[PDB]
Design a protein around this nucleic acid. Structure first.
Length: 157
RNA sequence: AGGACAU
């Protein structure tokens, strides 16, 4: 069931964010529907980072369900925030969303990531990040290595 | 605290 691409090419000047979800099902809806949405402030943060990118660069989203003990996949932003997308799939609180392109669907346990300490987050491990916590690039590429190296939320389908 | 942090 997992989706693990042979390579991930990360364009220079790209940025990386932890995405958290209170629900595995919202994540699945993201995969099938190619959209995601964050909080009021979370969206503002992602929207601003996405607008700021030099041309080739991307924004990577590393997904993790709350209290799940793992990360479960990787997506890119493929649009800025829009209003004309179908946010009814989340029922509410997420009135805007942006397009995402899924790259990796695979579980990676927190155990395997708790070595990566985030300097701008008081040296806390990446596994202890809030939604839209930014990750430095060199640390991110190491994490991406772990994603491409087996369970997935696409198995019971 | 108008924010989908860990065991």
């Amino acid at each position: 069931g997992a989706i693990i691409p042979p390579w991930i090419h990360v364009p220079d000047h790209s940025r990386f964010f932890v995405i958290k979800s209170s629900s595995l099902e919202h994540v699945k809806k993201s995969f099938y529907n190619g959209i995601w949405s964050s909080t009021f402030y979370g969206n503002k943060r992602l929207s601003e980072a996405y607008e700021s990118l030099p041309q080739g660069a991307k924004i990577y989203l590393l997904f993790s369900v709350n209290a799940s003990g793992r990360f479960c996949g990787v997506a890119e932003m493929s649009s800025n925030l829009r209003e004309d997308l179908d946010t009814s799939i989340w029922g509410s609180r997420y009135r805007h969303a942006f397009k995402v392109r899924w790259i990796v669907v695979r579980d990676v346990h927190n155990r395997s990531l708790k070595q990566f300490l985030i300097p701008a987050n008081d040296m806390k491990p990446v596994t202890n990040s809030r939604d839209t916590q930014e990750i430095p690039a060199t640390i991110s590429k190491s994490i991406l290595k772990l994603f491409k190296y087996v369970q997935s939320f696409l198995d019971d389908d």
